[PDB]
Design an enzyme around this catalytic site. Sequence first.
Site, PDB file in Angstrom:
ATOM      1  CE1 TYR A 175     -25.207 -29.616  35.713  1.00 35.26           C
ATOM      2  CE2 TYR A 175     -26.918 -29.537  33.966  1.00 35.26           C
ATOM      3  CZ  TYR A 175     -25.587 -29.431  34.367  1.00 35.26           C
ATOM      4  OH  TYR A 175     -24.638 -29.096  33.437  1.00 35.26           O
ATOM      5  CB  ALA A 213     -26.326 -25.887  33.625  1.00 39.41           C
ATOM      6  CE1 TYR A 214     -18.981 -24.190  35.125  1.00 39.79           C
ATOM      7  CE2 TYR A 214     -20.304 -25.109  36.925  1.00 39.79           C
ATOM      8  CZ  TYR A 214     -19.144 -25.100  36.143  1.00 39.79           C
ATOM      9  OH  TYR A 214     -18.132 -26.014  36.344  1.00 39.79           O
ATOM     10  N   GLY A 215     -22.264 -23.541  32.145  1.00 40.94           N
ATOM     11  CA  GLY A 215     -21.568 -23.593  30.822  1.00 40.94           C
ATOM     12  C   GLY A 215     -22.495 -23.786  29.615  1.00 40.94           C
ATOM     13  CD  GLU A 261     -21.145 -31.894  33.267  1.00 39.45           C
ATOM     14  OE1 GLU A 261     -20.048 -31.277  33.405  1.00 39.45           O
ATOM     15  OE2 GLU A 261     -22.166 -31.366  32.752  1.00 39.45           O
ATOM     16  CE1 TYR A 295     -18.631 -25.520  26.476  1.00 43.22           C
ATOM     17  CE2 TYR A 295     -17.091 -23.914  27.439  1.00 43.22           C
ATOM     18  CZ  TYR A 295     -17.950 -24.990  27.570  1.00 43.22           C
ATOM     19  OH  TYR A 295     -18.198 -25.462  28.810  1.00 43.22           O
TER      20      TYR A 295
END
Length: 169
Positions: A6, A8-10, A85, A126
């Site tokens: 997986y 993940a970029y956030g 998601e 965030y």
Amino acid sequence: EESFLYFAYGSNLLTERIHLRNPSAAFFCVARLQDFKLDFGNSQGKTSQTWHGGIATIFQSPGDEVWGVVWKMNKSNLNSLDEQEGVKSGMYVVIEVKVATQEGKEITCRSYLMTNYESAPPSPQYKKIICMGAKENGLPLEYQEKLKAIEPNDYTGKVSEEIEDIIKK
């Protein structure tokens, strides 16, 4: 073979964050997705009531790059991750991407992006979680400078207790 990768970029850059719902995810590597650009937005025009700002997505854009963390998880966790998601509500679509480690090794991963959204800056919270993850997991310095340069929105109200606790420490 029992497991999957997986990318993940956030907010799932941050180990403490991904561990909230996916406590068995294991750091696998840092990697670069070529010819994609990071953006932030409101899926189907709706503002996230968790983050109170745009949440992360990526789109294809020659010359741009997105760095992230590849996590290893059990294939048993696959449905859960799709639920997190909001795939079923149309907030992200499942993608497959091929990313490259710093040694130039290519890795095939599952990831997610939004297909129908309105550009909108992220909340300070965030943004902090993202920057914290990028630092924590050792994304390149130049990319971290890029994340730190993002202009957030002006939300200063309450986010979740568990989110707030992560930031405080």
